[model samples]
Target: EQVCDVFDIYAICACCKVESNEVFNNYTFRGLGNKGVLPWKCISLDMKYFRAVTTYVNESKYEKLKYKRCKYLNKETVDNVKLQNVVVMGRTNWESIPKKFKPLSNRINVILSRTLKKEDFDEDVYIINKVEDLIVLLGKLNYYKCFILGGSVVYQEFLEKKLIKKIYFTRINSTYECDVFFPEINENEYQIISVSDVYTSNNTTLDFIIYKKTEEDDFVYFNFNKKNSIHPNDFQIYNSLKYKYHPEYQYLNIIYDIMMNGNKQSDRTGVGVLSKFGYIMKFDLSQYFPLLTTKKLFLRGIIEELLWFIRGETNGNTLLNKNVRIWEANGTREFLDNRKLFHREVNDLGPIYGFQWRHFGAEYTNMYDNYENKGVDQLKNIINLIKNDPTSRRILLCAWNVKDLDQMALPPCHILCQFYVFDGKLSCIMYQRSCDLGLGVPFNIASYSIFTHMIAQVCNLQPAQFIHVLGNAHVYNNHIDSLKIQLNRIPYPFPTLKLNPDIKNIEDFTISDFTIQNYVHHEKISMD
Candidate 1:
């Protein structure tokens, strides 16, 4: 259980130190002489840090009016739980109470400070003070349900550390001119769970509130008070603190500029680059298609390959004879077409996804019975199994079919995907397996996300999370520092990642489905 120790402190304790100690000592049933029921016992607690100004207060300082059986309780039981023993835990500087006031004996006073070092408890909780040392103290304590009862600094410490779970605020209808006060907490993060007015001393009324950490949807940041709301999880707050920019919006801007200015007659490398990037910045797939208009996508040929991928074929031969001939120049057609092939080629292409799915034999290089077989439906099948069965081997999608790669015209792009189901949401883990970092990494991200969205839509589901795993994710030598400079760009808030027309087949959706609204940025980042 992620439980926290409760420490309590009130305004009175923050005031006169001697009065506070007296209040604590008396309330915990100190120094009861003849009428005391328990044996007379005393212990010294280390409390040097409290600045405990223990000026001797005379007997007249204490107020006493009546006496009950144990001197403090009006009833033996309440709420079906019998009041057995009173355990008073705290720290003190002195060995014993002042002789004039030592007359109470019904309570057991356990000095907590005695069990710890003096330097540990005396630290300050001011925001300007050291925070890490204070944070370490919180975790060092070993208690399942420890409660702190009277030091304001201690109370504020818990609040600053986010260790406070429930707070019982007693509004006394009175204001005071105090040296220190707790800062206002965001009500959205903490809310009043219950309210009731009760008459205590001096007509003080109390308020009870139970606080809980809000979900991502519930957490919002605003500039003091305005309609301007900062979107959640754009860039990490820590990064934003350091760079004064959001990483998410920067990635989006890169897409926006391409969409608005890309030309058909422009450079083919630019089109390839954009085509390769499948709209990764915008994780939401309601919008965005992989096709690039800057240059025509040999559309018929590309679509044929996409169809082949969906059909789960690994062989380059099917692609060789296809109407779209991206791979037609590879294999036997290599010399016939005088194509500038990247590498040497061999035939007898093994089943890609289809082979992995239907016949496991095509998966291995040796064609032996025991090869690390992988299939196309391995992705969606794993997702379904996790959502429906939770524990199954079918959740793995093998993009790195090595045997097929050995004989392929060119290696498959956007390899390996994994599926996970968490909190009623479907998520995907994409392993680019390898990336070019500068030229190809961006494309890999978008392509994989789009693929996940497409598969998720086909499975009658929604996208929950997207994780990109890279095996040597490094910016290429020429693009290294430039990429770092680009990373400095701040991302605009939400609505930057939105889709138009709301819905469409993942495959049919064009880049036009994506639109950026109220997008603002400092300037265009030069990643050259």
Candidate 2:
């Protein structure tokens, strides 16, 4: 029973004549009296070698040596090991291996044997007689990548000599009544480098772990990029030059700066505003869609409303049918009464954007006037100019008609948009007379960007840029807290816009023809 811990149950010692249950391999009795003996200079009856062998002895005994292999032996580890790997094992371990899978196919195998000769009638096998000669023989044969497969004594020898630099260990959930265990390892000399999550195989639960010898134990060290880099919580990394700045966040930064440092001003609404004059913010539509990522914007409503204007319809009923309520605020009876505008119907925004865009410079009598023959279709004309005379500087569309300003319910905030075509790309410079930064600027940015994309599609051009120039960019007094909330949040990545390629006419598009993919953003902030 005492000898079972030092060797397998079927093992014997040649030098001391210490016998276990039985002897299966001639290499099992290797020291003092075996045919292939240890060097004569080191053979002795010392207690140090005997004391190194210990058994757990009982079910309740918790021995440090009773360990399983690592659970996480993945394909990377397999590939690393199989790249010309040489494995050495004791004779009992070699025999215990199944014959059908012998010599580990494509791997060089070395077997330690005491009584067995080198010509023991075998192929694909190498014989080594001593543990001390294993390393030197590997060096002599120029095999740098090697591993040790073990019985009890073979594991004990290599472990004591400190020849291993990395150990892969696995632990099983079940307990087996085995007489042998893996050799004990020094905890101080090794550090756990990899641990796998729980996994199941063959109806048994297990985990794979890997440990590397400390730098002091071996003259090598490993530094992982993710492990050695500065943490996200560190302020130094946050302020570093390598960190990228969000373009949408740069928009919020300008808004916040304007609010903190701008002058106080009165506006058309009774509610006052913090105002800044002549502010310009540019967006690269090729890189991003110019939609605010800090807070959720109504992209559906923006797209539907832009499509409504593109259809040259000024009646609110068209927008209301699509569940787009942006025109509802400007179409209310109270809003019209405040402006003293003449409207024949309740929700008719007369001679507004759609009227001026599709039928400009026409005699405006009512919302549903048959002026298709009288007025010039500015939008249609520009689309033609883009396709034919793409290099022309006169490709422009204007919504703020000076003669028809009083006939409308609410004047257009975004008044003038000049399109420039360069190198088969369409870019627009939009000018707004008055900008409401918190509640309205996001819509204006997205709406014009959609307009740019629609027109670019019809003209066979790519949407490249949208430059927004504001005259009075102001934040309402009621929306300060909400803007602060948006300024504190991080921006998500930009979404992509896909337009159907078959639609060639500017007026041929519906909302169903466009798709927005991966539109991720922060939670919605209420402007009210």
Candidate 3:
């Protein structure tokens, strides 16, 4: 019913002493403090930036309150609840703070120490030894978010575990002693996401520089050393600092990028195409179903097609009974003859998606023959692995059968899919060798999303993510004009997909067993 946003785990870091030229964890002469006290002055401006980013809480999300009474509202109950973020620090940092400011105002002050007890500290200060324990304790405190305000060792512990997502760094220009050090962050792993204009006050010149960790190899290079901080124009839709991503924009982004930066190629379909390769998009099944809102979708055909595949029925005529003919063109007699599948009767699709899914490596004896235990039942095995040995990495389904490609009316375009189970939730990564952005890609997204959800239901797992990796993703030249219309339009929120609770077996799911609620979209698009 809601977007399951991951709680933000940010770090409040400061690099000081122009002479030391060091940061806390980085070896470039960085240190948080000297003798448990900051060597550099806490300019009012730097603390201002710290307070703004760390103390803010989004009130609409009240997940924290269900756990414990918070710093913002003590002596609270189920009815009286309030929210505040948390600041995590070591015992040294706690002692370093001045006595008057011992218990910092808004945010929950949590101290990490192996030898300390909650009774040893002020009534407001909470004590915990392990980082993971922050959850159970903070849940009781009912805090909104967490910030890692560290000394060197504390920062290193968090960084080594790769827990922190964003960091607020204020590199104030001043000279002072630094005995403690923070480790180095390889620029290869972190990106400078934000930089503030330099401010000068009380003989201190400094600016706020923010860094966030990226993937293993996504490099970002930006020089905030000399230039002014970049600012968006007066009409920015989302805020500069707090932008939330909408997954549909990923679809539009790839298409837009191909139009702007792709090479021209003539596709096998004999239509002009602007071709690009290796485009990836991910959808959160735990939050929303990835149906496109830029254009209306044919949910009926999509659902029927997936169920047909699950049923192991290669007869395209069976789908025709449901008025689902998206495959009708490929299953035509003329098309089959040209593709050297003339032996297949009209609408007998041979060993295509359905056959490969339910009976991999089975003999192709047309669409009518029963394939009971004739080959590897991949779907069954996949569900079994998910339920029994979820940690095993071999839970994979391959629709692209090299042995049966010649017999299929059309070889698989969406080739393989692999499943991942974590924390009672399931995720899938599916790969497609060919993608038609204008027409087929939308269907592919919804299809895999539904497929993952169905598999999760049978395995008693919640659906988490569906990642689509496309090769040779292209925009057919003929469909470019219609794509431009979608590019210009903003996407509506994704609809919710509800599956019938009674449907446990994948083969038992019918179109009526599925419902799409709150579906809002533009008028239908006939790109065919």
TM-score of each: 0.35, 0.55, 0.57
The backbone clash count of each candidate, in order, is: 21, 13, 12
Whole-model Cα lDDT of every candidate shown, in order: 0.37, 0.63, 0.76
Ranking by TM-score: 3, 2, 1
**C-alpha positional error of residue 449 in candidate 3 after TM-score superposition, expressed in Å:** 0.5
lDDT of 2 by residue, 1-528 (tens): 121121111111212112332212112212232232221223222222221221112333222212110112222221234123456778876776568967665555778888667786465567888975664454333222455656666767766666666654443322233445555456576544544333333333333344465556443443333221223433221232222345564567566656667677767677777878887877777755657767877778888888788877888987788788998988888877777864547688888888889888887776666666668799988988999998889998999998888878878888989999989999999999988889888889888888898888888899988998989888887777677666655454455567889999888887888876545567778987
- lDDT string, candidate 1, 148-251, tens digits: 33233444555566655554332222123333333344555444343321111222111122233335544544334541112234323323332222224334
Q: What digit string (tens of lDDT, one per residue) describes model 3 on residues 1-528?
A: 111123356778777643421112223325568767887755677677787887788887665544333333343553444678889888888888888876878978889899998876777778887987875565455567788889888888787777777777766545568887666776676655554544454554455666777653333333334311113332132223332245776887798778777788886778878878897898878757778877888789888888898889899988999899989999898999999876779999899988888899989897899889888889888888998999989999999999999898888998999999999999999999999999999999999998999999988899998999999898898887677666655444466678998998877888899987545567676675
Report how far residue 36 has shifted in candidate 3, in Å: 54
How good is model 3 by TM-score?
0.57
1 versus 2: better lDDT goes to: 2
Candidate 2 vs 3: which has more lDDT:
3
Off by over 4 Å in 3: 1-244
For each candidate, C-alpha RMSD in Å?
Answer: 23.6, 21.8, 20.2
